[PDB]
């Protein structure tokens, strides 16, 4: 990000925390009581269920 | 793909087994030390554009 006008440099880890997280936190779910996930499938018009 | 190949060829049921695509060759990687880049007044985006 930057180099202190007095040697050394400033890194992303200096200004923020990093890591793998959800791409979106809005939706979430559980199954019977345990953390879970899932894709809902909508049938395509005309296709056979 | 290399085990597949040198195995299927011990298999008296197949022949002429060739992978279709290409094989990895040597490629000249580039390392850019931004530590000496920012310490030289040279952006970093200007190097890439370069």
Swiss-Prot record, chain A:
Induction: By growth under severe iron limitation. It is found in: Cell inner membrane. It comes from the Bacteria. Disruption phenotype: Disruption of MexA, MexB and OprM significantly reduces active efflux of N-(3-oxododecanoyl) homoserine lactone/3-oxo-C12-HSL/PAI-1, but not N-butyryl homoserine lactone/C4-HSL/PAI-2. Component of the MexAB-OprM multidrug efflux complex, composed of six MexA subunits forming a hexameric tube, binding to a MexB trimer, which interact with the trimeric OprM outer membrane channel protein. OprM is thought to not directly contact MexB; instead, MexA joins MexB and OprM by forming a funnel-like hexamer anchored to the inner membrane. MexA may initially form a hexameric ring complex with MexB prior to OprM, then OprM undergoes a conformational change as it contacts MexA, allowing the periplasmic gate to open. Belongs to the resistance-nodulation-cell division (RND) (TC 2.A.6) family. Pyridopyrimidine derivatives, such as ABI-PP, are not exported by the MexAB-OprM efflux pump, bind tightly to a MexB hydrophobic pocket and so potentiate the activities of antibiotics such as erythromycin. The inner membrane transporter component of the MexAB-OprM efflux system that confers multidrug resistance. Functions as the major efflux pump for n-hexane and p-xylene efflux. Has been shown in one study to be involved in the active efflux of the autoinducer N-(3-oxododecanoyl) homoserine lactone, thereby playing an indirect role in quorum-sensing; but has been shown in another study not to be involved in efflux of this autoinducer. Over-expression of the pump increases antibiotic and solvent efflux capacities. Implicated in the secretion of the siderophore pyoverdine. This is Multidrug resistance protein MexB.
């Amino acid at each position: 990000l930057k180099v202190n006008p007095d040697g050394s440099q400033v890194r992303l880890k200096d200004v923020a925390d990093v890591g793998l997280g959800g791409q979106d936190y809005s939706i979430n779910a559980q199954f019977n009581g345990s953390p879970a996930s899932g894709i809902a499938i909508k049938l395509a018009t005309g296709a056979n269920a | 793909r290399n085990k597949f190949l040198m195995l299927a060829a011990q298999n008296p049921a197949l022949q002429r087994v060739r992978p279709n695509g290409m094989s990895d060759e040597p490629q000249y990687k580039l390392e850019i030390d931004d530590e000496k880049a920012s310490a030289l007044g040279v952006s970093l985006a200007d190097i890439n554009s370069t």
